[PDB]
Structure formats: structure tokens, C-alpha cells
Ligand binder design. Structure first.
Ligand SMILES: Nc1nc2c(ncn2[C@@H]2O[C@H](COP(=O)(O)OP(=O)(O)OP(=O)(O)O)[C@@H](O)[C@H]2O)c(=O)[nH]1
Ligand SMILES: Nc1ncnc2c1ncn2[C@@H]1O[C@H](COP(=O)(O)OP(=O)(O)CP(=O)(O)O)[C@@H](O)[C@H]1O
Ligand SMILES: Nc1cc(C(F)(F)F)c(-c2cc(N3CCOCC3)nc(N3CCOCC3)n2)cn1
Ligand SMILES: Nc1nc2c(ncn2[C@@H]2O[C@H](COP(=O)(O)OP(=O)(O)O)[C@@H](O)[C@H]2O)c(=O)[nH]1
Ligand SMILES: [Ca+2]
Ligand SMILES: [Ca+2]
Ligand SMILES: [Mg+2]
Ligand SMILES: [Mg+2]
Ligand SMILES: [Mg+2]
Lengths: 322, 436, 423, 54
């Protein structure tokens, strides 16, 4: 049969993946340090990619792309977009950003600075300000804060969109058909973090939708009722464009085609939408969790698309981006 | 002209040496009886091929080579084989019983009793050199003799020939081609002891050679002959600059100057293309752009690792056959826009290129097809550290239980030598990390 | 790289004789020592086990030892009996009465010097001796007591040579006397200290294989010895034939023995058929790892493999062999220790045994072997707690303390196996 | 991309391309370590022979 190891005990998605694998009866879980595995569910940090693919006669597959951190760290993402010609400093869907160390971009930020609201943040701690000196006093990124978001009604409230994307070992790009809007319960106040930060913990509330999560069916119905457009037309075209642009840009650096081991990886893309129905990329998460109600579906999809394609057993929930 | 002496230690060193000198003779037009009709200077000369071959008054061209093994069965095949007349009997040195896959037995117990004989035989070769450059040393990491006797010999060569360069061709262990279970121990012990004595070392992972023979030569079960004839092609392309007219890598010192900016980090990655089956009925010849592009494919490297996730310190392209500079530069230009090639900040982003117009020679009856052009890329990249990490991890697994350690202590080695050698490797891994 | 073979006592000489029959047949040597083979592979390493005498004669490098003449008279009259060097028959008249003390301390001590004289003469005409292999049982008196005395004396004279034994472990199911557990416990302590590799052959497993698998209603000692001689041929294949492996006794011990005391191997063989049917590689590989094909009555699933050698003989697909070896390791993933990387070796030899187109021999260094020493220890203690049958040994000058120490040492060995089973 | 140090002969040629610029133990000691290991082997053998003598 097939064999796998679990090295990230703290991953909700792959705990569910491991559950499904064992429930097929054709997969056996080994101890964490057993080298004779087919499938590694790896740790988030310091994953030993250099030890993969050297076991005689074993096809080895891992659930992370070596090098994908370039996309999934804030400063890395800014640097990648500015320095990659297929993305450009003139990239229209990524907010004007600058890398600041406490290679440094302090002077050019001050130049452009000289609506002037910016947000300072890091993947390591969030400050939204209108004044340049306060941000600097507070590796970090200073990003143009989107002053005019699209506000849901009733509530006059901000949101962000999470899209889940699975890249398999052939570098097919699969967008999960279900995304989530993570909303603020407080009304937006441009004149208190709760109304400006949409994170679930910060909000955790529940007054308009359960757990401050709106799914695509309701959001599309809202776009029809209030703005006479659809989610596919006004938003999803841009999201699919941005996902494909990002992942195609790094494909030569990370692809495991013709490599002695194979990778897939699940990504969490986070977007903002402004009042002109323009979509902005905010961040890419390399180890996403999932919404509670979508776990069953997406995790089964990961097994169907990313694992059983390499290790076959004895309608698609994904949109293939091409 | 400055001479080079090749030294082949243990089974892997000897059998690879056989393959190399067979190929050298074909490249230079030397018959197995030592005669070389194209050489119009009888009994001497200072041509480039004389760096590897001396000459007798009878016109025989004799390899500047010593073969050493602690049991006789491998070298006896040299003594009775096709090229038996090529070597003088003093060049072929055998003991009675081998090191039994045990570094300590090759280094201490048996090495102590044969090292003075080996050095005497080398001295006899050195005495016939007008300007000896140094040594090329072929051996396995994993064998008791290849690991243990080699490291003893390298120490004594540094004593007896202090100003001479020493290059290594080292076979790194792969379970797919018969390994002893203790080869991680032997590899770490020999790398620790040899590190300061070697100026530049070319590692060849048997796993990579094995897989190239399976995929490109369509050999289901590669034998040592298949493996060694491929290895010898790569060795020949590395040493061709010492044996033919040229301006690049013309002496052993230049390998260090061009490939090794930091002394400890002296393990260049070799990549070779194309490798084409001679049984392949229909074959289309590959261009300069295609073989150069193939140099950045992990499937063609001598050690499987991923250079996209390291940094380059130096890069040398060695072409053989129908290649002109204009095509090389056009190919490099295209490759730079499409591949992840990152150099360390304190090195130029460049390539040293050597072209020899003679296409690669193939052994008649071999598995390798004759091609119009081929290339060997030598790059010092931090990605080769992956091979050290793999080996150090296997060492750690066994050493935590002291498995098999009593065999080494039984030969008079102290247990502290294990952890001393492992700590040197830990610092080596850290060195690559800081650079990369 | 010569090996010197010694066979001691009744079991040792009957199994040894069959071994020499089997490998003489494999090397093309007829009952008169003349070579009549058709392949140069038969002669390439013939000197490992045979001396060459003038007349194109090959003589086993074998010393036949016993404290009574009967079994060695049967050897000399047996098939291939004339092949042995007549000077190499060393025997007394008294017997050892199934008594370790008589073999080790009284009767055997009177004879051991003349055996060492023959060992010395064989070793002196060796270009480069590898070491010794001894065939004996542990449950009698000569093989067990004089055999281990011999090992101790050989170690003293040749401290840097390898010593291997093929040791037959007694079982109450196939027993001659009740004192076998005493004789075996006393011997096991000697083997722990003075051999580098011991192939543990359990008469219980041999009987069960003959009755259950070979469908032999009434197995005889000859039937048991057919299985042993086949296994000994298979384990020595890599010494006897020009393998690509380049293996000698020391290399084998280095690769198989991670801790000096844990050198007791479970051997196995396939096929075992109750036949002209072709055996496929999947069948060969599955059988050779099956407990029912192993010759120590221990369940490998009760322990963990430290090291494994699997030797295949005949013309077969190497690629299919590797696929099956990987598959079987997947099925036994829990049963290999993970702190010895790549601890399963696959070897292949082109020459098949007689009557088979392909076969496979298994050699496992498993912690489950502790079950064998536990059984012996139990049978020992049931008698020793009442000092039953001890007068046979104290009458030869032994003290009860020597029994207490031997039992303590074997229980220690069991503890060590358990320590690494849980590592 | 600049080509420098171009050398040509009948056998071939060589040159350098730049894409971007940048931004021991003595004999006595060896003999000692070999002799120390030999002495340890001798001590271990002498312990064996003493054990066998007992
Ligand atoms: N490529 C290649 N590898 C070989 C060859 N011979 C042995 N090896 C590899 O070398 C390692 C074993 O070491 P050997 O060179 O045979 O041993 P040795 O140096 O003779 O030392 P001892 O026999 O232990 O005294 C293993 O990893 C083998 O796979 C060969 O001819 N070609
Ligand atoms: N440039 C910008 N303009 C407007 N809002 C922004 C912004 N950058 C961040 N935000 C808001 O801040 C919130 C959290 O920011 P950020 O995305 O940096 O945290 P985070 O993404 O690291 C947690 P997670 O990985 O679950 O998304 C987002 O939900 C978004 O609403
Ligand atoms: N009777 C035998 C036969 C072999 C036989 F294989 F040689 F036939 C081995 C054996 C096992 C083994 N391993 C035990 C398990 O861990 C890996 C190594 N490695 C080797 N060699 C490797 C080095 O070259 C010589 C042979 N031999 C042991 N006993
Ligand atoms: N497999 C096998 N076991 C034997 C044979 N002869 C005796 N035995 C076993 O060996 C033990 C008796 O030892 P034995 O060799 O006869 O005594 P010894 O002559 O004093 O060494 C008992 O366990 C018997 O079961 C034999 O030919 N084959
Ligand atoms: Ca000349
Ligand atoms: Ca008497
Ligand atoms: Mg984040
Ligand atoms: Mg050898
Ligand atoms: Mg009897």
C-alpha cells in the first residue's frame, strides 16, 4: 500500500487529509522520522527538502513547494513584485508598498509620501496612520492603505476575500470554487482597529452572518441586488488573473517537473475590493486554514487532485486556471 | 610542460582508473601496447599529453599512474586485462586482505603497514618529472580502503609534496549500487581527515550515474562497467585541459583559482550533456543551446541537488566538439533570462568557457553514442551541501545508538574521532549556509 | 582467502558431511575429488573451501572431530566420504555422554591438542586465511562442549581471525536427552563471547517445516539435515562464487553485527516445496520473509530487524527483485529499525542450486531471536531450581556456580535484545 | 555581456563572459597517531589473552 508521514501536528487541513487517507484503507501512517514514505505532510519551517527523493524505488511527494515562501512573506512579496518584469513596479493590482528595515526603501517611501494613509505591518504588529513619522517610529512593509473599500450593507462594513488555491505536481493551478468573505462587524470609520482589521480573531460580532463569514452564494446575490452585477464578472475575473500571474511568475524557480521528488501546495490568497469593484491583492498565505464548513470538501479535493493523481487508489470542486 | 600523477585507491578508484586510462589512450591514439604512431618524437618530448604519459626509448607511452588496493583481485584484472602492457609492475600495488568496509582498518591497521611502500612507488614516478604539478586521487567515500587509506595517503602527500596541488574524484555512496551499511561513517571520517589536504574535489553520486544509465542509456540494471564508462567521460572532460593545448585550466592550480574562492568549500558540482544511447536507432543531434540548457537540469548532474535554491560562486563551461564562442554566448543569453542563476554578491556573474574542437571519444562497443558536441559544466554552488546534509543525517541516526562503532574502536580508533569528524561536517554545513 | 571448516560431534559431522556434498556438487567436484564441471565460475573461488592436490584433485579444507568413532566411520563410508583428507579425521573412543562438561573439561580436553595440530597444519598452507566456520549442535556433549572449547583455543592462537558457527539449538520436540537445555545454556555463553556470527538453527523449526510444509509424516534427522545443508549452501554463496559483491567473512560480520554480542542470525530458505513448477520472483520474495520459511522458531513480527541479507540464486529479473523487496519492506515497515539506514541488502548469484532454477536465502539479525534464548532459559530453570540431573556435571568437576553464571549471562543477552527492540 | 581573455589555438579556444560584476600535521605527528592506535590494538589484544589465560 501507500505510506505517509505527518510532521505538522498543528495543521487543521492536513489532519483532515491524514484522516481521509487512513479511511481509504490503502494508506498507512508511519512514524515521523521514517524515511520510507511516499507522502510527506511536512513541517512549516526548515522542511528538509534536501533529503527527499533519494530512497531507491520510492516515489516521494511533499505538500510544500520549496521556494514558495517568496510569495508567502510580506517583504518577499513586495520585492518579488517590484523586481519581476512579468509583475512590474507598475503592477496595477498590488497596493504601493515599501520594504523598511528598523535593500532598504525608507527614502523612496518618504518621497512618494511627500489621501495619504498608510499601513505598516509584517509577517512576524499593525499600525494604520496618516503621518509618516509615526509609522517609522513604530523587517516591515509600509503599504498604501485602501482608503475607499467596498462596504457591505447594512452595516457600512469592510471585508476581505480568501481564495484557496491548490497547485499540484504538474503545476496545474486549481482555484477552489468556494471562497470566504471575512467581514468586520463594526461600521467603517475613516475619522480603533476593529472596523479596519477584518481578521477573525480581532472581530471575535456574528450579528449579520455567523462567525463574520459570508460565502459566495450570499455575496453574489448581494452584488446582484445592490449593484446589478455578479461575483464572477465584477471580482472573480480579477482574482483568477492575479492568482495566475503570481504563480506563473515563480514557476521556473519552484516547479518540480524533472525533479527527483514532487511537490504540491495549498495557498491562501487574500484580496481587498474597493468601491469601484477593483480587486487588490493583500497577501498570500503558505499554510492556510479553511472555513469550518468547507473543510470536508476542500480536503477531499486535495486527496483527489494532489495525492491520488500521483498514487492512484484501487463534478470538480476546482476551477483550473489556464 | 608539467607532469600530473594519478593515484587510484581501492576497488572504485582502480576500476574507474581503468576506464579513464582506456579512454585517454583512445583520445590520444595510444594503442594498448603503449605505442603511439602519431608521436614523432621517439623516447621523449614535452607535449601536452606528456603531462599524463611518460615515454620509454622503445616508444612506449606509460601512464603516470599508481594503482593501490589492500586485496589483489581488482588490480589482478588490470594485470591480466586489455591494457596490461601499459603499466609497469611497480605501478600496481596490492596487499593481502582488505579493510572490510572499515575506515579504521584502512587508515590505522593496514594503512600503517603499506603507506611507506606506496610513497616509495610514488616517489619513483615523481623522480621522472621535471616539474610535477601534483596529484589526481580517485577513490570511494564508502570503502574501507577508499576512505581510510586515502585519507592517510593525502596527509603524507601534504608532508612529502607540500607545494603540490591535490585534486580528488570521490564516489559518494548510494544504496542502489552495493553499499556497506557503514558507508556514512566512512564518508564523514574520510572527509574530515582529508578536508585540509585537498584543494578541489569532484564528488560523483553513484545514485545520479545509476539513474542516468537507466534513463538515458536505457540500461535496466547498470553494472560497474556501465557506470565507470560514463564517469570516465566526465573525468576526461574535466582533465582534457591538462592533456591538450588550451588556455583554460592548464594546470592543477587553475582549478582552485577558477572554482574555489573559499578553501573548505571546494566541492564543485559537475553536470554533463548529452548522454545518448548507442543502441538508439534514430537520434537527432543536439545544438549548443540545447546541451548548454541541459547543464541546468538536475537530471544531468553528478550529484542530485537543486541549484535554484543555492548560490553560485564560480562556473566553468567545458565544451568538446563543434562549438564556436558565438553560439555559447547566444545560448547563455537565452538561459539567463529563463533560469534561476543567482551568484553570491562578492563574485562576478560570469562563466569561464573552454572549447576543444575534438568531439568526445567513445569506447568501441560501449553504451554511449558518438555526438557532434558535448559539454561539462563545473559550478561551485552551495546546493551541493544537500549531499552533506543527507550523509550527516544517516551518520546521526546510527551514531546515536553507537551502532557498528565497536568495529572502529576495535582497530585502535578512538570514539572521539567520530564526534570530532561529525563536528567538522556540522561546521562545513554551516559554512555553506552562511555563503548561500 | 581460505576458510577452515571444522565439524564436531554427531550432529556437526552429519550436517557438515551433507554441506560438503552439496557444495562439491555445485563446484563440479565428484566423490573422488576430481573436477568435472562445465563453467569456469565453479573454479574461480574454489580455493576458499578446497585445497588443490596434484592430479587435479580438490580436498575440502575440513577437520572432522568427535569423541567416539561411529559417526565419522559413517562419514567415511558415506557418499563423498572419500573426498576428505584422511589425516583430518580426529577422534577419541570414550564418547562425551551428551555431557557438556565431558566435552569441555575432561574427555574433550584430552583430544583438543591433536585437533589444534590439524587446524595449524591447514592454516599454515593458507595464503591468507579469512577464518573458521564450525558446525555443531548445542544440546549434546562433543559438538557443544568440545566445540566451544575448540573455539576458545582457536581464538587464543588466532585472535585476529573471524569465527563463524552454524549452531543447532535443541528442542524438546526433537530431543535426545533431558539435559540439552543445560548443554545449550553453557554453550551459548561461549558463543556470545567467542564467535563473530552464529547461524541459529532450531530443530523445532526444522521439524515443523518438514511436517507442516514438506508434508513429511515422520521427519528423520536426514530430512532435517537436507534443509540445513541447503541453507548453508545459500549463506556461503557470496563467498564461493565470483559475485560482484567482493565479500569475505569480515565484511559480512561488519555489515551484519551492529553490537558485538548481538550476532545470532535467523536463517531462512525458499522454495520449500512438497516439483517442477516455476517459482516467480514475488513468490520467492514473499516466502523467504515468511516466518514459516525461517529456521529459528521465532516470529519476526515479535521483534525488529537490525540487519537483513537476502541472497537470490538463478536467472531472474533484477528489476522484479527490487520491486518485490521494496513491497515486502512496506508490508514489514514496523519491523525494521529506523536508526540503521538501508539495513536490508539484496545480493544475486547466477548459479542456481541443484534441482532448482531459482531460490533465495534469508539471513536476519532480528531482536525476535530473544524468544529462542527465552525458551532455553525456561527449560534450564525448570530443572536447575531443583538441581535435577546436575550430578552428571558435578561428577566431572563442575560447580553449581558455573551454572548460575551461564544462566545469568543468557538472561543478560535476552535483556540486550529487548533493549534494542524498543529503541 | 562582455567577452574577455579570448585565446585561440588549432585545438580550440577559451574565453570569459561576464554578465554582471560583483557588489598541517607533520610526519612525526602522523607517525605518533598511527602508533597510538597500534598500542590500543595491542592493549585490547593483551586483555583478551589475559581473559583466555584465566
Ligand atoms: N561508480 C563506481 N562505484 C564503485 C565501484 N566499486 C565500488 N564502488 C562503490 O564504492 C563503495 C565501496 O567501496 P570500495 O571502493 O569497493 O571499497 P574499497 O576501497 O576497495 O575498500 P575495502 O574493500 O573495504 O577494503 C560503494 O559505495 C560502491 O558502490 C566502481 O567500480 N564504480
Ligand atoms: N493596504 C491595505 N489596505 C486596506 N486594508 C488592509 C491593507 N493591508 C491590510 N489590511 C487589512 O488588515 C487585515 C489584516 O492584514 P494582514 O493581511 O497583513 O494580516 P494577515 O493577512 O497576516 C492574517 P491572515 O494570514 O489570516 O490574512 C486585512 O483583513 C485587511 O482588512
Ligand atoms: N551471508 C551474507 C551475505 C551477504 C551478502 F549480501 F553479501 F551476500 C551479506 C551482506 C549484508 C550486507 N548488509 C547487511 C544489511 O545492511 C546493509 C549491508 N552487506 C553486505 N555487503 C556490503 C558490502 O559489500 C560486501 C557485501 N553483505 C551478509 N551475509
Ligand atoms: N538437525 C540435526 N540435529 C541433530 C542431529 N543429530 C543430533 N542432533 C541434535 O543434536 C543434539 C544432540 O547432540 P549430538 O550432536 O548428537 O551430541 P554430540 O555428538 O555429543 O555432539 C540434540 O539436540 C539432537 O536433537 C542431526 O543429524 N541433525
Ligand atoms: Ca614524444
Ligand atoms: Ca582416557
Ligand atoms: Mg499572514
Ligand atoms: Mg575492496
Ligand atoms: Mg547423539
Amino acid at each position: 500500500m501507500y505510506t505517509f508521514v505527518v510532521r505538522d501536528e498543528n495543521s487543521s487541513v492536513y489532519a483532515e487529509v491524514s484522516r481521509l487517507l487512513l479511511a481509504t484503507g490503502q494508506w498507512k501512517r508511519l512514524r515521523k522520522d521514517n524515511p520510507r514514505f511516499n507522502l510527506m505532510l511536512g513541517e512549516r519551517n526548515r522542511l528538509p527538502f534536501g533529503r527527499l527523493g533519494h530512497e531507491p524505488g520510492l516515489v516521494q511527494l511533499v505538500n510544500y513547494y520549496r521556494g514558495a515562501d517568496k510569495l508567502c512573506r510580506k517583504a518577499s512579496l513586495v520585492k518579488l513584485i517590484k523586481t519581476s518584469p512579468e509583475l512590474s513596479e507598475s503592477c496595477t493590482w498590488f497596493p504601493e508598498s515599501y520594504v523598511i528595515y528598523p535593500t532598504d526603501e525608507r527614502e523612496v517611501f518618504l518621497a512618494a509620501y511627500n489621501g495619504n494613509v498608510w499601513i505598516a505591518k509584517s509577517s512576524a504588529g499593525i499600525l494604520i496612520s496618516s503621518e509618516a513619522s509615526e509609522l517609522l517610529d513604530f523587517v516591515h512593509v509600509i503599504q498604501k492603505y485602501l482608503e475607499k473599500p467596498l462596504l457591505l450593507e447594512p452595516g457600512h462594513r469592510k471585508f476581505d476575500i480568501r481564495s484557496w488555491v491548490l497547485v499540484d505536481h504538474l503545476y496545474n493551478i486549481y482555484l477552489y470554487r468556494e471562497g470566504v468573505l471575512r467581514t468586520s462587524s463594526e461600521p467603517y470609520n475613516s475619522a480603533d482597529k476593529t472596523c479596519h482589521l477584518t481578521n477573525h480573531c480581532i472581530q471575535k460580532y456574528g450579528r449579520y452572518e455567523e462567525g463574520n463569514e459570508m460565502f459566495f452564494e450570499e455575496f453574489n446575490q448581494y452584488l446582484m441586488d445592490a449593484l446589478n452585477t455578479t461575483l464572477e464578472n465584477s471580482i472573480l475575473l480579477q482574482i483568477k488573473h492575479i492568482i495566475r500571474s503570481c504563480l506563473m511568475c515563480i514557476e521556473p524557480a519552484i516547479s518540480t517537473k524533472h525533479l527527483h521528488y514532487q511537490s504540491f501546495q495549498l495557498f491562501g490568497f487574500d484580496f481587498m475590493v474597493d468601491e469601484e469593484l477593483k480587486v487588490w491583492l493583500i497577501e498570500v498565505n503558505g499554510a492556510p486554514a479553511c472555513a469550518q464548513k468547507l473543510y470536508a470538501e476542500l480536503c477531499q479535493g486535495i486527496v483527489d487532485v494532489a495525492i491520488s493523481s500521483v498514487f492512484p487508489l484501487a463534478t470538480s470542486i476546482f476551477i483550473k486556471l489556464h | 610542460m608539467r607532469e600530473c600523477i594519478s593515484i587510484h585507491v581501492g576497488q572504485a578508484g582502480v576500476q574507474i582508473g581503468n576506464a579513464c586510462w582506456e579512454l585517454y589512450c583512445l583520445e590520444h591514439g595510444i594503442q594498448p601496447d603503449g605505442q603511439m604512431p602519431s608521436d614523432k618524437t621517439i623516447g621523449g618530448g614535452d607535449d601536452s599529453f606528456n603531462t599524463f604519459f611518460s615515454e620509454t626509448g622503445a616508444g612506449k607511452h606509460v601512464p603516470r599512474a599508481v594503482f593501490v588496493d589492500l586485496e589483489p583481485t581488482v588490480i589482478d584484472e588490470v594485470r591480466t586485462g586489455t591494457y596490461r602492457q601499459l603499466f609497469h609492475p611497480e605501478q600496481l600495488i596490492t596487499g593481502k586482505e582488505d579493510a572490510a568496509n572499515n575506515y579504521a582498518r584502512g587508515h590505522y591497521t593496514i594503512g600503517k603497514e603499506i603507506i611507506d611502500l606506496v610513497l616509495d612507488r610514488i616517489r619513483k614516478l615523481a623522480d621522472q618529472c621535471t616539474g610535477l604539478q601534483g596529484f589526481l586521487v580517485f577513490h570511494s567515500f564508502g570503502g574501507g580502503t577508499g576512505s581510510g587509506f586515502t585519507s592517510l595517503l593525502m596527509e603524507r602527500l601534504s608532508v612529502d609534496y607540500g607545494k603540490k596541488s591535490k585534486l580528488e574524484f570521490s564516489i559518494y555512496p548510494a544504496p542502489q549500487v552495493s553499499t556497506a551499511v557503514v558507508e556514512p561513517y566512512n564518508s564523514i571520517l574520510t572527509t574530515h581527515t582529508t578536508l585540509e589536504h585537498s584543494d578541489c574535489a569532484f564528488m560523483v553520486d553513484n545514485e545520479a550515474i545509476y539513474d542516468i544509465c537507466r534513463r538515458n542509456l536505457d540500461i535496466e540494471r547498470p553494472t560497474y562497467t556501465n557506470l565507470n564508462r560514463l564517469i570516465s567521460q566526465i573525468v576526461s572532460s574535466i582533465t582534457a585541459s591538462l592533456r591538450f593545448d588550451g588556455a583554460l585550466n592548464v594546470d592543477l592550480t587553475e582549478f582552485q583559482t577558477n572554482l574555489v574562492p573559499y578553501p573548505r568549500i571546494h566541492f564543485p558540482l559537475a553536470t554533463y550533456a548529452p548522454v545518448i544511447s548507442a543502441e538508439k536507432a534514430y537520434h537527432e543531434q543536439l545544438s549548443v543551446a540545447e546541451i548548454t540548457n541541459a547543464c541546468f537540469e538536475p537530471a544531468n548532474q553528478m550529484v542530485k541537488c537543486d541549484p535554484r535554491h543555492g548560490k553560485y560562486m564560480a562556473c566553468c563551461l567545458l565544451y568538446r566538439g563543434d562549438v564556436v564562442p558565438k553560439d555559447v554566448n547566444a545560448a547563455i543569453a537565452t538561459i539567463k533570462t529563463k533560469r534561476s542563476i543567482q551568484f553570491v554578491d562578492w563574485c562576478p556573474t560570469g562563466f569561464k568557457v573552454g572549447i576543444n574542437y575534438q568531439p568526445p571519444t567513445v569506447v568501441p562497443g560501449g553504451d554511449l553514442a558518438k555526438v557532434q558536441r558535448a559539454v561539462c559544466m563545473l559550478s561551485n554552488t552551495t546546493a551541493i551541501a544537500e549531499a552533506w546534509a543527507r550523509l550527516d543525517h544517516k551518520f546521526d541516526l546510527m551514531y546515536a545508538k553507537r551502532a557498528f562503532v565497536h568495529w572502529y574502536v576495535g582497530e585502535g580508533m578512538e570514539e572521539g574521532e567520530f564526534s570530532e569528524a561529525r563536528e567538522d561536517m556540522a561546521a562545513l554545513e554551516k559554512d555553506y549556509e552562511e555563503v548561500g | 582467502r581460505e576458510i577452515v571448516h571444522i565439524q564436531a560431534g554427531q550432529c556437526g559431522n552429519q550436517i557438515g558431511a551433507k554441506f560438503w556434498e552439496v557444495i562439491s556438487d555445485e563446484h563440479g567436484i565428484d566423490p573422488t575429488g576430481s573436477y568435472h564441471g562445465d563453467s569456469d565460475l565453479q573454479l574461480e573461488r574454489i580455493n576458499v573451501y578446497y585445497n588443490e592436490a596434484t592430479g587435479n584433485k580438490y580436498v575440502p579444507r575440513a577437520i572432522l572431530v568427535d569423541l567416539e568413532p561411529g559417526t565419522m566411520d559413517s562419514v567415511r563410508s558415506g557418499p563423498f566420504g572419500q573426498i576428505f583428507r584422511p589425516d583430518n579425521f580426529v577422534f577419541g573412543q570414550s564418547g562425551a555422554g551428551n555431557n557438556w562438561a565431558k566435552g569441555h573439561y575432561t574427555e574433550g580436553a584430552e583430544l583438543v591438542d591433536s585437533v589444534l595440530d590439524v587446524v595449524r597444519k591447514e592454516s599454515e598452507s593458507c595464503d591468507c586465511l579469512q577464518g573458521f566456520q564450525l558446525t555443531h549442535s548445542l544440546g549434546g556433549g562433543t559438538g557443544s562442549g568440545m566445540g566451544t572449547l575448540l573455539i576458545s583455543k582457536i581464538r587464543e592462537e588466532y585472535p585476529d581471525r573471524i569465527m563463524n558457527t552454524f549452531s543447532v539449538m535443541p528442542s524438546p520436540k526433537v530431543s535426545d536427552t533431558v539435559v540439552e537445555p543445560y548443554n545449550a545454556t553453557l554453550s551459548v555463553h561461549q558463543l556470545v563471547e567467542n564467535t563473530d556470527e552464529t547461524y541459529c538453527i532450531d530443530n523445532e523449526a526444522l521439524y515443523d517445516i518438514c511436517f507442516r510444509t514438506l508434508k513429511l509424516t515422520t521427519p528423520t534427522y536426514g530430512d532435517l539435515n537436507h534443509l540445513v545443508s541447503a541453507t548453508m549452501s545459500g549463506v556461503t554463496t557470496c563467498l564461493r562464487f565470483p559475485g560482484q559483491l567482493n565479500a569475505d567473512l569480515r565484511k559480512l560480520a561488519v555489515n551484519m553485527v551492529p553490537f558485538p554480542r548481538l550476532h545470532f542470525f535467523m536463517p531462512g530458505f525458499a522454495p520449500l516445496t512438497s516439483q517442477y513448477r516455476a517459482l516467480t520472483v514475488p513468490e520467492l520474495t514473499q516466502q523467504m520473509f515468511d516466518s514459516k520459511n525461517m529456521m529459528a522458531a521465532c516470529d519476526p513480527r515479535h521483534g525488529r530487524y537490525l540487519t537483513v541479507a537476502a541472497i537470490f540464486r538463478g536467472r531472474m529479473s533484477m528489476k522484479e527483485v527490487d520491486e518485490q523487496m521494496l513491497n515486502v519492506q512496506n508490508k514489514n515497515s514496523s519491523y525494521f529499525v529506523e536508526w540503521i539506514p538501508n539495513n536490508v541488502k539484496t545480493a544475486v548469484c547466477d548459479i542456481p542450486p541443484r534441482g532448482l532454477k531459482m531460490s533465495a536465502t534469508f539471513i536476519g539479525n532480528s531482536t525476535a531471536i530473544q524468544e529462542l534464548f527465552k525458551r532455553i532459559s525456561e527449560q534450564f530453570t525448570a530443572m536447575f531450581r531443583r538441581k535435577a540431573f546436575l550430578h552428571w556435571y558435578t561428577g566431572e568437576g563442575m560447580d553449581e556456580m558455573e551454572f548460575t553464571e551461564a544462566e545469568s549471562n543468557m538472561n543478560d543477552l535476552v535483556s540486550e535484545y529487548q533493549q534494542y527492540q524498543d529503541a | 555581456m562582455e567577452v574577455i581573455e579570448l585565446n585561440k589555438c588549432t585545438s580550440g579556444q577559451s574565453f570569459e563572459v561576464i554578465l554582471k560584476p560583483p557588489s598541517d600535521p607533520s610526519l612525526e605527528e602522523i607517525q605518533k597517531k598511527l602508533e597510538a592506535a597500534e598500542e590500543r590494538r595491542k592493549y585490547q589484544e593483551a586483555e583478551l589473552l589475559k581473559h583466555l589465560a584465566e
